[model samples]
Target: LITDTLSPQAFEEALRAKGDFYHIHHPYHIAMHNGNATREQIQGWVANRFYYQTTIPLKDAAIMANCPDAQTRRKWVQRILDHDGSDGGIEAWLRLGEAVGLSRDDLLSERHVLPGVRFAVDAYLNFARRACWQEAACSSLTELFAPSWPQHYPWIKEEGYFYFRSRLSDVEHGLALAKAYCDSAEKQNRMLEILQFKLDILWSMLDAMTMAYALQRPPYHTVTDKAAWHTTRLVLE
Candidate 1:
């Protein structure tokens, strides 16, 4: 725990350093970015990540609903717009799915989303729904550590790149918000923990993909030939 309150700049630096844990360093991600991933691997990744993309606005809206500051709420709403708007990140990600040869229905149906990926993403949404708005908002500071957009995947259609392009400016808003809210030593440490939690979610999602796509060791590989993951809706009503 941070025993002494850090200056805003120092706290920001500490948060930036957490990028070392970002999923870009994951072996699965590295393989994809290095162009070593097979077509199936790329498609699987896009399909699974489509789940995360669709839920991003829900996470953002959770933050907005929890926050009482009108100014902060106003700025944060743009994130939802960026993801949920007519030509938003979700649409761009769907285009990416098509670019990778996944039909729109394939992604929309969410049949390919793995159980582990769903669990991690739902945990994030739950955290945003339950934590204080500042902590939930600070979790987004993971964007601060995101590396530059991957440009080596020439197979992806040009239209799929818009979401990555749009995020370049959004990182700044998250950092300023974290800096403004985390003013005490305890808050600083908690913010770091929240950031780490978010990082773990990303890494865990990749781990699930690696097991299913790269290693070919998906759950129940020994027992069944079909996909063994649970249905998209686990409950029957």
Candidate 2:
């Protein structure tokens, strides 16, 4: 809204960026390694988990405010909100969480946020708001891997992850987004740079949550070796 820097094509790129961030944590990987998680449990967790979801743009806002340059801020200002006139990363999470029975009121309250989640997310804000640009960009590195989340979500809906497999429909679109980015990465370097910043945020969030609630050890679940996680520009066969 502020400049001509944003075009439909650019926005599409942004959406891909967002979707890629989502994949790394795909639910299939969760159940595969965790041993006893059910689909209902997975869905229920989704419902309850996004309290921290809405915080991303707010964190971006905090970081943007600290920046004194137009070029740098311009790069991120519009993305401050998701394309839907909502906060980007956080809003999407809330929409999905609500689809799973979470309420706006409850999501806003934060009363029930997992202890580790709070610490990690808050620390994310601190790092973004206070750190230099590269550090801030690094905070977003996890975005590169987030798209992987979709690859693993299904193990919850089928086989033994049955606690709440019914909710898989809610996340199908999310999976599509993930599959596309992992299949084709255009700005692999720039995205990896930015995503590293976010990955720290993600890793910290997981570490704290892993230690805090230990949800079937959900937060501690292994994703991939660094090589797998950091694989560059996948070439789909």
lDDT of each residue in 1-237, candidate 1, tens digit only: 689999999999899889889899999999987778988899999899989888888889989889999998988898888787746667777877887778989998998998999999989999999998988887887776665224666666665555445542467887887889899998899899889999999999999999999999888898996887874645311
TM-score of 2: 0.50
Q: Distance from true position, residue 7, model 2, in Å?
A: 31
Q: How close is candidate 1 to the true structure, as a TM-score?
A: 0.89
Candidate 2 on 171-215: residue-level lDDT in tens?
Answer: 232223333332334433444345545555555554444433344
**Per-prediction TM-score to the true structure, in the order listed:** 0.89, 0.50
- Which window of ten consecutive residues has the lowest lDDT sum in model 1? 160-169
Q: Write down the worst ten-residue block by lDDT for model 2.
A: 228-237
Compute the lDDT for candidate 1: 0.84
* Backbone clash total, candidate 1: 0
